[PDB]
Design a protein around this ligand. Structure first.
Ligand SMILES: NC(=O)c1ccc[n+]([C@@H]2O[C@H](COP(=O)([O-])OP(=O)(O)OC[C@H]3O[C@@H](n4cnc5c(N)ncnc54)[C@H](O)[C@@H]3O)[C@@H](O)[C@H]2O)c1
Ligand SMILES: NC(=O)c1ccc[n+]([C@@H]2O[C@H](COP(=O)([O-])OP(=O)(O)OC[C@H]3O[C@@H](n4cnc5c(N)ncnc54)[C@H](O)[C@@H]3O)[C@@H](O)[C@H]2O)c1
Ligand SMILES: NC(=O)c1ccc[n+]([C@@H]2O[C@H](COP(=O)([O-])OP(=O)(O)OC[C@H]3O[C@@H](n4cnc5c(N)ncnc54)[C@H](O)[C@@H]3O)[C@@H](O)[C@H]2O)c1
Ligand SMILES: NC(=O)c1ccc[n+]([C@@H]2O[C@H](COP(=O)([O-])OP(=O)(O)OC[C@H]3O[C@@H](n4cnc5c(N)ncnc54)[C@H](O)[C@@H]3O)[C@@H](O)[C@H]2O)c1
Ligand SMILES: [K+]
Ligand SMILES: [K+]
Ligand SMILES: [K+]
Lengths: 392, 392, 392, 392
C-alpha cells in the first residue's frame, strides 16, 4: 500500500519509514504494531504489511535517508545496523515541496525552508500543486497522514471554515490569512478520495468544512494528536481511581524534551495546545475534575527522549490523602512510528469496508479523538477490537 | 447486617469497623467504597450500609477499641475525633479466642497470645468452639471474612484437602499437622452456611475440600488476597503494554513496610506467599511471562505506610528499550478497609440472589482470584458490574 | 533572647514559636537545629535556648495561637498535643500592625489585611511607627528576622537604593514608589541598631543603602532566602559531579505546593523571585552553567507540603549521557522553622562578638547568601564552623 | 605508563582501555577523569596521561578487542566509531592466563574458563607464573589494578593472613584452601615492587600479611572497591542530614543490574561482599546507626546499566517525618572506567613521591577505603586534594 506523509522528513515519519522497510526486509521484529496483534489477524487480507512512501516537506533535505540519518545522529533511537540496511530504500524516497502557510513564529527553527507560497503562488495554485503531487503518487491503496510540526491555534473563521462551500471560496479568493497548511493538505487528501489521518494537534480535517467534504466524498478519516506517552499512561490509569471510588484531588504532569518540537512548544504562545489537553481528559474518565496541571518544557540534552513526571494526589477511605508518582522515559518517535503504520492499515481497512467520515473507533491512537467521549484507554481498545471485529 | 472478622484486632479489621461506624454516625465521607459507586445503586435493598461486628483473635486485648487505638497511635491514619466518637461502639466489640494452628514461626512477633490449640484441645473441639462462637453471632445476614496474618504454605495432603470426606476425617483424627487456622475458620463458616471471604493469601477456603463444602451447602464464597495498592497499579498498568503490542522485558516490584505484617512476611517463612504471585499474574495479562522480581522488606519507621517501587523495562518499535517508574505511597489499612465492607455487602447480595460456590465475578478485589483467569483491572471491573446487573 | 518576626502570623513563623515553646517546656526533642550541633557547644554562653516573640503582621487574627491553629488545621504538621500545650504562651503573643507596601498582586491572595499605609500615613511616620513598635519590645538581646510573603522585584532606583543618603531622602520626601515593606522593616531593625536577618527572596537589607547603614551602625546581618529543601539537595549534590569531572548537560527542578505561599507565588510577577537563581547557583559550584530550569507551581491539595522533582542529565567517560532523579517530600515550615531560631542565636552571637555588616559566614542558611561565592553545602558548613570556632 | 589489569577482558577494564586509546588518539574528551581536574595541574610531570595495557584473565578470548567488542555489542556504552578507531590498539593486547582460586560458585557463570590450577599446579608455581607474566611486562612505571569478579568471603586463617611469614608459608606449603586469586595477584605485585590497587570488594592486599609486605618493600597501595554510583550519591548526600541536625530513621538502597556481576551477586553466597558494608557507612557520616537495608538483585535486561532506588526517611523539627527519594541510572563501566586510569595515575605519583603502604588519602575512589574512617565524599575529596598538595 501507499503512504503519503505530511512532514515526511521528521523523526516520527522517517522512523516509521525506516521501520516499515526493516520489517519488510525481515531484519526487525513486528513489536510495537497494534495491527499485528492476534486480534487483528485477518487485516493483512485488506491491507498487507507493505509500504511505499512519499510525502510533503518544507525542509531542504535531499531524501528520506539523509533525513533519517540526521535524526539518528542525534538520538541513536535504533541500531546503526538497521539504518545502513535501509539506506537504499529510504534514499529513493524524495519529498515534494510543501506549504507552511500560517505555521507561526517557530518555523524559523527548522533551519532552511522552501515553500509553495515562497514561489509566489495563489492559494488555488498551491492547493493545485499539493493535489497533483499526491495524485501522481496515489493508487487505490493510498492513505494520507499528517505528522508535521504542530501549528498554532488557527485564525478561526465561521465563513471559511464553517462549510465546504466557504472553504473553497477561501482557496479561489486566494485568502491565505485564513488557511493553515494542515487544512490544505487534508482538503487535498479528502478531495482526491484518499483516507486521511491527523497525528498532530493541528486543525487538519477537524474543521466542519473538511468533515462535510469527508462525508460527501465517502472518505474515512481519523484523529487527532497521537496518544503515545505520558497521556497513554494517564488515560490507562486514571480509571483505576474511578473503579476504586477514590477521589483524585490533584494531578500533575510535567514533561521535558529537546529537539525541533519542544524548542517550539516552549513559548506559551504555541505552548497552549497541550495545557487544555490533559484534564478535561480526566473529567471524562472520573466524572469530576481534579486540580490539574499540564506542562511541557524545553530541555535540549534530552532531544527526542521526552521525559515526564506525574504526581497523583488522591483521597481514600475516611478521606485520607495518599500519593502516587510515576516517571515515563521513552523516545517519542519509537512510540509514535508504529501507530502511523497501524493507522494507515486500519484506515485502508475502513476504506475497503466502505466506512465514511470520522472513524470514531480509532480513538485509541489519539488524545483529542474526534467525535467521541471515550477516553479511558481500556474502553478505547475494546472499542477498536469491536469495530474491527464487526466489519471484518 | 453482620460481619464476623477473623483477625479482628488487626489494623485492616479495626479501620474497617472505625469507618463503618463513622460513616453510619454521619461523621466521615463514603470515599473508597466500591459498593457505593453509581452503577451499584439499589444494592441497599439487599445489603444496606449497616454493620455489626464480632470476630476471632489470638491477641490479648480487651476490645476492638483498644486494638483500634493501638494501631492509631503508631499510625495516625485517621483523625483523633473519629477515634473518640466511635469509642463506645468499638468498646462493645469483643473478639473470641481463635487458633494459630500452623501459622508460622513469626507468630512470636504479635507477642501475647492465647489460642484454642493452646488449651490442649483437639481439632474436633477447636472446630466446635469456632463454630459455636460464630453460630452465637450469626443471622441470615452475617458474612465471615478473613483478615488474619498470612499463613505459610500449608503442609500438602491430597487425602485431607482433596475432598470434604478427607477434611472431615482430618478433623475427626486430630491430624493437626495437615490443618491450618485459615482452613478451620473457613470450614466453620461454611458448615454454618454463612458466606465466606478470604482477604489474605492463606489457603482459607480455596482448598478443594472446602469448595466442595460450599457447593454442597449452597453458600457463596470469594478470595483470595485483597488487591489494595501496588498490585492494583500493576493489573491496571500492565495491560497498556499489551494493548500497544509492547514487550515487557522486566518488571520489578520492591515494597518496604513496618508494622506487624512487616517483620514476619520479610524473612523466609511467610515471604514465599507473595513472590509466586506476580509473573503468573503478568502472564495472565501480557500473555507471556517476563523477568519479574517481586519483593517486600521490613522497614520499621514506615509502619502501616507501605511504599512500593516499580520499574518496568519494555521494548517497543524496532526493539528499542524504554523505562517506566512508579512509587506508591499509601497507608495500607486505608486502601484495604473499605474493600472489607464492600466484600461483605456483595457477598450478602450474592447469597440473597442464590449464588453458591466461588463468586468468580468478585476478582476485582483480589490478587489471587479463585476460578478466574481474568486479572486485567478493567476486565475485572466490567465483570463485577455485569454480574451485578445480571442478578440485580 | 527576644526575637521580632516580620510576617509573625505565617506558618513558618508560628511553627518556630510553637517549637521554641515546645522545646522550652520539655515536650519536644531538639532535632532540626544547626545551633544545637556539638561543634556549637559553648553557644548558650551568649545565645541560650530561651525565646520571647513579637512581630509585625497585616492579617487580622487575635494572637499567634489562632495564627498557629489555623495553619495546623490545614497542615497537621505536629501533634494536637503540642499545639495545646503552648496555647497559653502563644496567646500572649500579639502581632502589631505593619506595612504591605509594594508587595505584589498576591497581597490580594492573603484574605483580609489592615496596613500602616492603609491609615494613609507617610513613609516617615510609617517608619517611626515600625521603630517604636520594635523599640518597646527590644532589649539588648533582641534580633529581627523577616519571614513575610515574597515581594516582587523592587522598583529599580539607584538614587534611592544606592546609598543611605538616598534612602533617607526617599523616606523624607515620602516617595513610596521606591519603597517596599521589606526595606522599611530592615531600615528599622538597623536604625534601632539590632541584628537583622532576611529569610526571604525580598530585598530587605540587601539594597546597597542598607548594607551601608549596617556597616556605619556596626550591626551584623544575614540573608537572603532560606535554603530549606530542594535547594539544599541541589547545593549538596551538584558538587559530586564536579568532584568526578562529569559534565552536567542539564538540570530540572519542578516544585509544587499550595497554602498561602503557593497562592502568592502562583502569580507570574511574584514568581520571578525564583527563576534567575539556580543557574548562577550551579555555575558557582560547577564553574560552567548547564541548561537549568527551576519552577514552582500552585497545587492546592499539597498545602504546605512542598514536593519537588529534580532531574540531572550528565556526561561521563567517553561522553556517555546518564540520568539522576530525585523526589523531595517535606513540610516546608518544619524545615524552615528551626533555622529561624538557629539564625537568631547566631546573629545574637555575632553581635556579642562585635561582628558588623553582612555575616557572609551564615551562607549555610540561604539560597542567595549575601557577599559570598560559597554555595557548596559542605563548604558552607565548614565556613560556619570555622567562623564560629574563630570567634569562640 | 604501563597498567596490568586483573580481569582484563572485563567491561570495566576494556572500557578503560577503549577510553584511554580514544583520548590519546585525541578522538574523545577527558570527561570523568578526576586526575584531569584543575587542582592536580602538574600530575603529569610524574604521570602523563599515557597508557600501555597487559593483564590476567581466565576467559578465552583472542585479545582485548574481541573482549571490548563483545561487551559493546551487549551494552552500546560508547560509540561504534570509537571501537573501530581503537581496534588495532586493543588487538595487540593479549591477556596472560591467571587463577580462579576460591572465587566460588560465581565462576561457573563466566563461560569457557581456563586457569593456572587447571593445569594441576601448586601455589608455589602459580605465583611464580603470575610474577613472571607481570615482571616481563613491567617497567619502572607500571601499576597493577584489580578489576576481577568479586570473590566470596575468604576462608579464615589467622596464621596465613596475619603475617608475611604466615602467608608465604601458605604458599610454600600449597595451602590452596586458604588463598584466593585476589590475594595471589596482590602478593605478586608487591613482591615485584609495583604499586597495587583493588577496585573490587575482594580482600586482595587488605589482609595484614599483604600490607606488611607493601611497607616492607616501600610500595604504595590503594583500595578497596570502587565507589561508582549509588554509594557515591549516598556518601555525598547523607552528610546533609548531619549538617542540618536531622535524624535518618531508615535508609533503603535497592539496586538492579544484569550482565556478569549481576549474575554473580545474585547467588546469595557472593552477594555478601556488600551486606555489612552500608550501616557502618552511614554511621561514619551521621554519628548514629539508623535502620538501613542495602540490596542488589539480578535483572537480565539491564545488562551493565545498574539502576538504583533509594528512599531516605528522616525526622526534623518537632520529630516530624519526611521523605526523600532518588533514582540513579548509569552505566557502571562508564562511571568506573575513568577511575581505573585515575587510580593508576595517582599511584605512580605516589610511588614517585616515596609514598609507601596503604595510601588512605585515596579513599575518594572507594566504598571500603582501607585505613581510614573518612566516608563523606566532600571530606574525602578535600583529603585527596590536600594530600596531593602536600607532596606536589
Ligand atoms: N510521539 C510523538 O512524537 C508524538 C505524539 C503525539 C503527536 N505528535 C505530533 O506529531 C508530530 C511529529 O513530528 P516529529 O516528532 O517527527 O518532530 P520533527 O521535528 O522531527 O517533525 C516535524 C516535521 O514536519 C515538517 N513540517 C512542518 N511544517 C510543515 C508543513 N507545513 N508542510 C510540510 N512539512 C512540514 C518539519 O520540517 C519537520 O520535518 C509532532 O510535531 C506532533 O504534532 C508526536
Ligand atoms: N493492604 C492490606 O492491608 C492487605 C492486602 C491484602 C491482604 N491483606 C491481609 O490482611 C492481613 C492482616 O493485615 P493487617 O493490615 O490488619 O495487619 P495486622 O498484623 O495488624 O493484623 C492481623 C491481625 O490478626 C491477628 N491474627 C493472626 N493470626 C490469627 C489467627 N490465626 N486467628 C485470628 N486472628 C489472627 C493478629 O493478632 C493481628 O491482630 C494480612 O495477613 C494479609 O494477608 C492485607
Ligand atoms: N522553608 C520555607 O517555607 C521557606 C524557604 C525559603 C524562603 N521562605 C520565605 O518565607 C516566607 C514565609 O513562609 P510561610 O511558609 O510562613 O508562608 P505564609 O504565607 O504563611 O507567611 C507569610 C506571612 O507574612 C505576612 N506578611 C506578608 N506581608 C507582610 C508585610 N509586608 N509585613 C508584615 N507581614 C507580612 C502574611 O500575613 C503571612 O501571614 C515565604 O513566602 C518565602 O518568601 C520560606
Ligand atoms: N561500576 C562498576 O562496574 C564497579 C564498581 C564497584 C566494584 N566493581 C568491581 O569491578 C569488578 C569488575 O566489574 P565488571 O562489571 O567489569 O565485571 P566483568 O565480569 O565484565 O569483569 C570481570 C572480569 O574479570 C575476569 N576474572 C574473574 N576472576 C578472575 C581472576 N581471578 N583472575 C583474572 N581475571 C578474572 C572475568 O573473566 C571478567 O571478564 C566487579 O566484579 C566488582 O568487584 C565494579
Ligand atoms: K517525536
Ligand atoms: K497491613
Ligand atoms: K531512566
Amino acid at each position: 500500500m501507499k503512504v503519503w506523509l505530511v512532514g515526511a522528513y521528521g523523526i516520527v515519519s522517517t522512523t516509521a519509514m525506516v521501520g516499515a522497510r526493516a520489517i519488510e526486509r525481515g531484519i526487525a521484529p513486528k513489536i510495537g504494531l497494534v495491527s499485528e496483534l492476534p486480534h487483528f489477524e485477518g487485516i493483512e487480507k485488506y491491507a498487507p504489511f507493505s509500504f511505499e512512501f512519499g510525502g510533503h516537506e518544507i525542509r531542504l533535505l535531499s531524501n528520506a535517508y539523509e533525513a533519517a540519518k540526521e535524526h539518528w545522529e542525534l538520538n541513536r533511537h535504533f541500531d546503526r545496523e538497521i539504518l545502513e540496511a535501509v539506506k537504499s530504500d529510504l534514499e529513493g524516497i524524495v519529498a515534494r515541496k510543501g506549504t507552511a502557510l500560517n505555521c507561526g513564529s517557530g518555523i524559523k527553527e527548522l533551519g532552511d525552508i522552501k515553500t509553495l507560497e515562497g514561489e509566489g503562488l495563489s492559494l488555488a495554485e498551491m492547493v493545485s500543486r499539493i493535489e497533483e503531487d499526491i495524485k501522481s503518487f496515489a493508487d487505490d491503496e493510498t492513505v494520507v497522514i499528517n505528522v508535521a510540526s504542530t501549528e498554532p491555534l488557527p485564525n478561526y473563521s465561521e465563513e471559511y471554515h464553517g462549510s465546504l462551500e466557504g472553504f473553497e471560496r477561501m482557496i479561489d479568493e486566494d485568502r491565505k490569512e485564513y488557511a493553515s497548511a494542515s487544512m490544505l493538505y487534508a482538503y487535498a487528501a479528502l478531495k482526491l478520495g484518499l483516507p486521511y489521518a491527523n497525528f498532530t494537534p493541528s486543525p487538519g480535517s477537524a474543521i466542519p468544512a473538511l468533515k462535510e467534504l469527508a462525508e460527501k466524498k465517502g472518505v474515512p478519516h481519523a484523529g487527532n494528536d497521537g496518544k503515545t506517552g505520558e497521556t497513554l499512561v494517564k488515560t490507562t490509569l486514571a480509571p483505576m481511581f474511578a473503579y476504586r471510588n477514590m477521589e483524585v484531588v490533584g494531578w500533575m504532569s510535567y514533561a521535558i524534551l529537546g529537539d525541533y518540537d519542544g524548542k517550539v512548544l516552549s513559548a506559551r504562545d504555541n505552548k497552549e495546545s497541550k495545557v487544555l489537553s490533559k484534564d478535561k481528559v480526566l473529567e471524562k474518565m472520573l466524572g469530576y475534575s481534579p486540580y490539574s496541571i499540564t506542562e511541557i518544557q524545553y530541555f535540549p540534552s534530552l532531544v527526542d527522549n521526552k521525559t515526564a513526571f506525574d504526581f497523583v494526589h488522591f483521597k481514600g477511605f475516611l478521606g485520607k490523602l495518599m500519593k502516587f508518582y510515576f516517571i515515563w522515559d521513552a523516545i517519542d518517535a519509537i512510540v509514535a512510528a508504529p501507530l502511523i503504520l497501524d493507522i494507515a492499515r486500519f484506515l485502508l481497512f475502513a476504506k475497503k469496508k466502505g466506512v465514511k467520515g470520522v472513524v470514531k473507533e480509532m480513538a485509541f491512537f489519539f488524545k483529542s479523538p474526534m467525535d467521541t467521549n471515550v477516553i479511558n484507554t481500556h474502553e478505547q481498545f475494546v472499542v477498536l477490537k469491536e469495530w474491527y471485529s464487526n466489519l471484518k
